Amino acid sequence: MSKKISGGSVVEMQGDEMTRIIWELIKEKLIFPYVELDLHSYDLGIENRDATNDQVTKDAAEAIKKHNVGVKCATITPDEKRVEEFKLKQMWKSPNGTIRNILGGTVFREAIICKNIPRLVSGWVKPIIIGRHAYGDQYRATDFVVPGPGKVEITYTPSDGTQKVTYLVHNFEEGGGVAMGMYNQDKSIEDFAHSSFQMALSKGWPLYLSTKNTILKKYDGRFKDIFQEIYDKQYKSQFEAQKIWYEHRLIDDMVAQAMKSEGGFIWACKNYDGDVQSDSVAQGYGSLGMMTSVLVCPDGKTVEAEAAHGTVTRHYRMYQKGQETSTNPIASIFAWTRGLAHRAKLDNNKELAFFANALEEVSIETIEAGFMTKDLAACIKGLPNVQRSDYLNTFEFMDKLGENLKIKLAQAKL
Amino acid sequence: MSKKISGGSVVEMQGDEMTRIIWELIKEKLIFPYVELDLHSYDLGIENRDATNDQVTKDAAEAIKKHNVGVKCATITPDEKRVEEFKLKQMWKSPNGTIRNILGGTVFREAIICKNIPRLVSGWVKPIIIGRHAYGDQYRATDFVVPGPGKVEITYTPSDGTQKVTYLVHNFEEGGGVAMGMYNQDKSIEDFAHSSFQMALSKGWPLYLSTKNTILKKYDGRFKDIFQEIYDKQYKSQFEAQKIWYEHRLIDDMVAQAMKSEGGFIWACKNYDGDVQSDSVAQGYGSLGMMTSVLVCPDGKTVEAEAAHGTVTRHYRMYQKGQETSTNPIASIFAWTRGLAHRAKLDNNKELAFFANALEEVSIETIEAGFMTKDLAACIKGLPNVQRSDYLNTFEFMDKLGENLKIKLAQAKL
Ligand SMILES: NC(=O)c1ccc[n+]([C@@H]2O[C@H](COP(=O)([O-])OP(=O)(O)OC[C@H]3O[C@@H](n4cnc5c(N)ncnc54)[C@H](OP(=O)(O)O)[C@@H]3O)[C@@H](O)[C@H]2O)c1
Ligand SMILES: NC(=O)c1ccc[n+]([C@@H]2O[C@H](COP(=O)([O-])OP(=O)(O)OC[C@H]3O[C@@H](n4cnc5c(N)ncnc54)[C@H](OP(=O)(O)O)[C@@H]3O)[C@@H](O)[C@H]2O)c1
């Protein structure tokens, strides 16, 4: 167009292996040509994390907390093999954990939808954002074995020196067993609620909290009550304003309704075992290359976007041998659009906001037009039947998006 | 032909609405013309359960425990609307719960496969039986709310006065929240394992056991260990003889593995509830009318079979107005075959065993020949594209299976 859009302040974290390659391609072909940013970029590549003794990771989280918008590229989480591969000098903790443990918030995973790409439920036309309440990786489980008869109890001792309360979870009369301890601070539940409500107002969809309060009448009921409270004291007004609404459901009714729904709703959910933050998601159904992720902070201001997958090592290896690759960039691309979309919102930057949207529509439109990477072509035909003529390589795809983006932005000039 | 197959003692449970109708059809058109049974019939119809203050439900459970074979028709779980519709004098509990509660066991959900009916994975050609740990009974976690700052610790107090052990669940410093303790006796794990290993032998496929032994190194470790103990010590041999095996996994991996599989295997889940993935979808994708359910007890003798779906009220309603309906009877039919097949096994009744399998083949063969109910067809062409000539009535279909069962059994004697 004319002058690049003044995007504002954004925090960018560079990553590793395959994602680092496509990441640079995204900035070079889809972001920089149209937006000027006051970039606070930190190199979270493994060699740099090692070199700075992981100091860069903290600095990145610090930066996000302060500039509110963070976009992250996938990073290698060291294990024995990695320690050996790069001669690391210590097994560095996952940077995703370090970041999440400093900013707090709830992660919401979404799978971009395309009409010509199969969904678990054909009827799903609009996406389904899902945020699971989970402790960070800094959480340590409290489970033991119990070898033989005896009683197991759970106890609460007020710190003000008042009557101690004991409960008796189970008395093992014969044989042994196994037992767990679990907890949740009200604050965490509030945060969970806040991040959930906001998320729904930004997207413009109805929120649904699923719990199993029928069984955990006090545990889960706690979530239910705290949601309603926060929903009435604040939010409800805006939900009605935006034609949206909040509402509770028993995990059993959700999974059923969800199966008969067309989609388009925020699904916050508390599971029996609870969950713990992890880097990976779970292959499952649908291409990981289409799985977005967003760490939404309680304050309504801070947000960190990233793809749901990892660095895609296998793909990288081939790229390292000069082999042709076909890595999906949608998930990474959406990390940028969601970040810029949030940015534009905090600053009432109409232009940037339009840009953010445009890039997503072009991403989706490009695929629905028949242009896609191998992973998607395989969702349509199945690995065995997929031919090369069925897809584009990593670079050809990036090139197609950029072309279509150029067309999209020109057409909007009217 | 002449003399009918002499089946043995089978406990039957009549149900409600639409299923009650297809249930009698199955009996008149598919079972009674070829098999004489020593029937212990219990009317679990909503009106009758109400008239007997639910004593019929308990007598049926008592009867199943006695004759080891029970087939069941879908039943109505009363809710407020149901209470008002039948002027119930109490909101009766799920007869399914009362029965599993009395019998104990592990429910196995298996979807019947048909070559011309789309599946989740074009690769799955063999069934994927999913069984979940049936806590039910009076088991329950001990949850409570934490008023304010204080410590919450779980304690194990040995019977042999041995060293008492204390674990800290969490120290509420901000004060406020919720906490809880969970437990599990070795026996439950054992029964679970027994039902699993057995179920993998009845069918002829390997058996996996998914777990999160990485997060809950003690709790889940117990399942892994106990499943192996009981395996080596009681099933290793038998599995070998059938060229079958057993291994442990990780939920994350299992779900992937299944996707990239051809099917044919038993999957035992320790997992709780469902979420954003193919749980209830893996066991039964598409139509609920092909979803079977089997309760297997530890004793390897008792079994309760029933369709996974419900009474199909929507169809029953149409039927009441004299509107044509197309209700899939496949699930209901397999509840009868699995049951009779088990009767046959327990009594070395080669004729009955022949009949059971014979009836299943006819069902599947009939659908693969293009004769099916509207739920299917919809799976093929999609609701919008289904035309009347694409499927059959609840009746026209039961009729088609009748003529086909006759041939099948006729040409068998020769
Ligand atoms: N920074 C993060 O958020 C994050 C998250 C998870 C993992 N990781 C890191 O990644 C490394 C291990 O990687 P991983 O094996 O778990 O990989 P991954 O990136 O999660 O994906 C594993 C497989 O998913 C498919 N896939 C994922 N993204 C794809 C895309 N964009 N396009 C096409 N196919 C895609 C590929 O299947 P095919 O091979 O069948 O094509 C690939 O082999 C570790 O160093 C780990 O710490 C980082
Ligand atoms: N006894 C049990 O195991 C059990 C289990 C679940 C529910 N229920 C009871 O069923 C009643 C409510 O029923 P629900 O709404 O949950 O119904 P449902 O029987 O579970 O099925 C709901 C929908 O599934 C489809 N469907 C299910 N079985 C089908 C079949 N055999 N052939 C064709 N389509 C089939 C129909 O879709 P279309 O409407 O799109 O055709 C039907 O409306 C309650 O009284 C509830 O307690 C009993």
State how far the Cα of A239 lies from the Cα of A237, in Å rounded to an integer. 5
Asked if B273 and A212 touch (Cβ cutoff 8 Å), the reply is: yes
For the CA atoms of B237, B241, B242, B247, the dihedral, rounded to the nearest 10 degrees, stands at 30
- How much distance in Å is there from the Cα of B288 to the middle of ligand 2? 8
State how far the Cα of A75 lies from the Cα of A88, in Å rounded to an integer. 14
Asked if A86 and A50 touch (Cβ cutoff 8 Å), the reply is: yes
> Residue A327: CB within 6 Å of ligand 1?
yes
Using the Cα atoms of residue B365, residue B366, residue B369 and residue B375 in order, give the sign of their dihedral: negative
CA dist A412 to A343, A348, A407, Å? Answer: 21, 19, 9
Tokens at A348, concatenated? 């009432």
Backbone angles phi, psi at A104, to 5 degrees: 70, -175
Three-state secondary structure string covering A300-329: CCCEEEEECCCCCHHHHHHHHCCCCCCCCC
B contact residues 272-311, partner A, Cβ 8 Å cutoff: 272-278, 280-281
A9, A108, A134, A145: which is closest to A68 by C-alpha? A9
Collect all residues with Cβ–Cβ distance below 8 Å to A320 and sequence separation of at least 6.
Answer: none
Q: Where are the domains of chain A?
A: 1-414
Which position has the token pair 């109490």?
A: B90
A260 CB burial (10 A radius; 0-12, 13-18, 19+):
exposed
Task: Please report how many Cα atoms fall inside a 13 Å half-sphere around the Cα of residue B55, on the Cβ side.
Answer: 3
DSSP class of A4: P
Three-state secondary structure string covering A133-199: CEECCCCCCEEECCCCCEEEEEEEEECCCCCCEECCCEEECCCCEEEEEEEEEHHHHHHHHHHHHHH
Three-state secondary structure string covering chain B: CCCCEEEEEEEEEECCHHHHHHHHHHHHHHHCCCEEEEEEEEECCHHHHHHCCCHHHHHHHHHHHHHCEEEECCCCCCCHHHHHHCCCCCCCCCHHHHHHHHHCCEEEEEECCCCCCCCCCCCCCEEEEEEECCCCCCCCCEEEEECCCEEEEEEEEECCCCCCEEEEEEEECCCCEEEEEEEEEHHHHHHHHHHHHHHHHHCCCCEEEECCCCCCCCHHHHHHHHHHHHHHHHCHHHHHHCCCCEEECCHHHHHHHHHCCCEEEEEEECCCCCCCCCCHHHHCCCCHHHEEEEEECCCCCCEEEEECCCCCHHHHHHHHCCCCCCCCCHHHHHHHHHHHHHHHHHHCCHHHHHHHHHHHHHHHHHHHCCCCECHHHHHHHCHHHCCHHHCECHHHHHHHHHHHHHHHHHHHHC
Q: Which amino acid is at B317?
A: R
Task: Please report how many Cα atoms fall inside a 13 Å half-sphere around the Cα of residue B273, on the Cβ side.
Answer: 22
Other CB atoms within 10 A of residue B257 CB: 16
Asked if A59 and A48 touch (Cβ cutoff 8 Å), the reply is: no
On whether any CB of chain B is under 8 Å from the CB of A156, the answer is yes
Strands B106-111 and B142-146: unpaired
On whether any CB of chain A is under 8 Å from the CB of B102, the answer is no
Tell me the technique behind this structure: X-ray
CA dist A247 to A224, A408, B94, Å? Answer: 9, 38, 25
Asked if A349 and A361 touch (Cβ cutoff 8 Å), the reply is: no
User: Per 3-state DSSP, what percentage of chain A is helix, strand, and coil (rounded to 5)?
Assistant: 45, 20, 35
Phi-psi region of A382 (alpha: psi -120 to 50; beta: other; left: phi over 0): left
Backbone angles phi, psi at B368, to 5 degrees: -70, -15
Which position has the token pair 């007997």?
A: B52
B241 CB burial (10 A radius; 0-12, 13-18, 19+):
exposed
Asked if B129 and B266 touch (Cβ cutoff 8 Å), the reply is: yes
CA dist A254 to A117, A240, A251, B312, Å? Answer: 24, 22, 5, 19
Tokens at B383, concatenated? 């609701």
> Residue A112: CB within 6 Å of ligand 1?
no
Q: What SS3 state is found at A28? A: helix
State how far the Cα of A342 lies from the Cα of A353, in Å rounded to an integer. 8
State how far the Cα of B219 lies from the Cα of A141, in Å rounded to an integer. 10
State how far the Cα of A121 lies from the Cα of B278, in Å rounded to an integer. 10
DSSP class of A39: E
- How much distance in Å is there from the Cα of B313 to the middle of ligand 2? 6
A134, A107, A128, A110: which is closest to A257 by C-alpha? A128
Question: What count of residues does chain A have?
Answer: 414
A contact residues 330-349, partner B, Cβ 8 Å cutoff: none
Asked if A303 and A10 touch (Cβ cutoff 8 Å), the reply is: no
* Beta pairing partners, A306: A72, A293
Q: What is the DSSP code string of A48-99?
A: HHHHTTTHHHHHHHHHHHHHSEEEE-------HHHHHHTT-SS-PPPHHHHH
| Closest CB to B122 among A157, A180, A382 | A382
Asked if B45 and B14 touch (Cβ cutoff 8 Å), the reply is: yes
Task: Collect contacts of B192-195 with beta carbons under 8 A, ≥24 apart.
Answer: B192/B106, B192/B133, B192/B134, B192/B223, B192/B268, B192/B270, B193/B226, B193/B227, B193/B230, B193/B231, B194/B230, B194/B298, B194/B300, B195/B105, B195/B106, B195/B108, B195/B131, B195/B296, B195/B297, B195/B298, B195/B300
Residues making up the binding site of A for Mn(2+): 252, 275, 279
DSSP class of A230: H
Backbone angles phi, psi at B163, to 5 degrees: -40, 120
Collect all residues with Cβ–Cβ distance below 8 Å to B243 and sequence separation of at least 6.
Answer: none
Looking only at Cα atoms, what is the longest distance across chain A? 79
Which position has the token pair 């995990």?
A: A251
Resolution of the coordinates, Å = 2.7
DSSP class of A33: T
Which position has the token pair 């919450």?
A: B152
On whether any CB of chain B is under 8 Å from the CB of A169, the answer is yes
A313, A261, A414: which is closest to A82 by C-alpha? A313
State how far the Cα of A19 lies from the Cα of A71, in Å rounded to an integer. 13
State how far the Cα of B326 lies from the Cα of B309, in Å rounded to an integer. 15
Q: What SS3 state is found at A373? A: coil
- Please state which architecture CATH assigns to domain B1-414: 3-Layer(aba) Sandwich (3.40)
- How much distance in Å is there from the Cα of B312 to the middle of ligand 2? 4
Collect all residues with Cβ–Cβ distance below 8 Å to B197 and sequence separation of at least 6.
Answer: B207, B230, B231, B234, B235, B239, B246
Tokens at A229, concatenated? 């409270």
C-alpha B60 chain-centroid distance: 18
Tokens at B161, concatenated? 């006065």
- How much distance in Å is there from the Cα of B72 to the middle of ligand 2? 15
| Closest CB to A183 among B141, B142, B178 | B178
Rg of chain A over CA atoms, in angstroms?
Answer: 23
Phi-psi region of B165 (alpha: psi -120 to 50; beta: other; left: phi over 0): beta
Asked if B357 and B289 touch (Cβ cutoff 8 Å), the reply is: no
Q: What SS3 state is found at A355? A: helix
State how far the Cα of A219 lies from the Cα of A184, in Å rounded to an integer. 9
Tokens at A378, concatenated? 């395989």
Asked if B359 and B365 touch (Cβ cutoff 8 Å), the reply is: no
Task: Please report how many Cα atoms fall inside a 13 Å half-sphere around the Cα of residue B249, on the Cβ side.
Answer: 21
On whether any CB of chain B is under 8 Å from the CB of A139, the answer is no
Q: What SS3 state is found at A244? A: coil
Tokens at A394, concatenated? 């990593």
Three-state secondary structure string covering A85-104: HCCCCCCCCCHHHHHHHHHC
Tokens at B127, concatenated? 């069934």
Looking at the CA of B291, name the nearest ligand.
Answer: 2
Tokens at A210, concatenated? 């699923």
Asked if A340 and A10 touch (Cβ cutoff 8 Å), the reply is: yes
Subunit contact A216:B153, Cβ cutoff 8 A: no
State how far the Cα of B256 lies from the Cα of A31, in Å rounded to an integer. 34
Locate the chain A residue with the closest alpha carbon to B378. Answer: A122
Asked if A13 and A73 touch (Cβ cutoff 8 Å), the reply is: yes
State how far the Cα of A220 lies from the Cα of B143, in Å rounded to an integer. 9
State how far the Cα of B399 lies from the Cα of B346, in Å rounded to an integer. 31
Collect all residues with Cβ–Cβ distance below 8 Å to A244 and sequence separation of at least 6.
Answer: A200, A201, A204, A205, A206, A207, A238
Asked if A69 and A39 touch (Cβ cutoff 8 Å), the reply is: no
- How much distance in Å is there from the Cα of B378 to the middle of ligand 2? 17
Asked if B192 and B229 touch (Cβ cutoff 8 Å), the reply is: no
DSSP class of A290: G
Question: What count of residues does chain B have?
Answer: 414
Rg of chain B over CA atoms, in angstroms?
Answer: 23
Subunit contact A180:B255, Cβ cutoff 8 A: no
CB pairs under 8 A between A and B: 240
Q: Which atom of ligand 1 is nearest to the CA of A307?
A: 3
State how far the Cα of A274 lies from the Cα of A133, in Å rounded to an integer. 7
Asked if A365 and A298 touch (Cβ cutoff 8 Å), the reply is: no
Return the exposure string of B164-189: e unless at least 16 CB atoms fall within 10 Å of the residue's CB, then b: eeebebbebeebbbbbbbbbbbbebb
Asked if A307 and A335 touch (Cβ cutoff 8 Å), the reply is: yes
B310 CB burial (10 A radius; 0-12, 13-18, 19+):
middle
A218 contacts in B (CB within 8 Å)? 143-145, 178, 180
> Residue B17: CB within 6 Å of ligand 2?
no
Tokens at B339, concatenated? 């049951």
Asked if B236 and B199 touch (Cβ cutoff 8 Å), the reply is: no
A376, A365, A349: which is closest to A408 by C-alpha? A365
Asked if B329 and B335 touch (Cβ cutoff 8 Å), the reply is: no
State how far the Cα of A229 lies from the Cα of B122, in Å rounded to an integer. 47
A212 contacts in B (CB within 8 Å)? 273
State how far the Cα of B325 lies from the Cα of B18, in Å rounded to an integer. 10
Distance from CA of A50 to the nearest CA of B (A): 26
CA dist A405 to A22, A394, B52, B349, B413, Å? Answer: 17, 17, 70, 71, 71
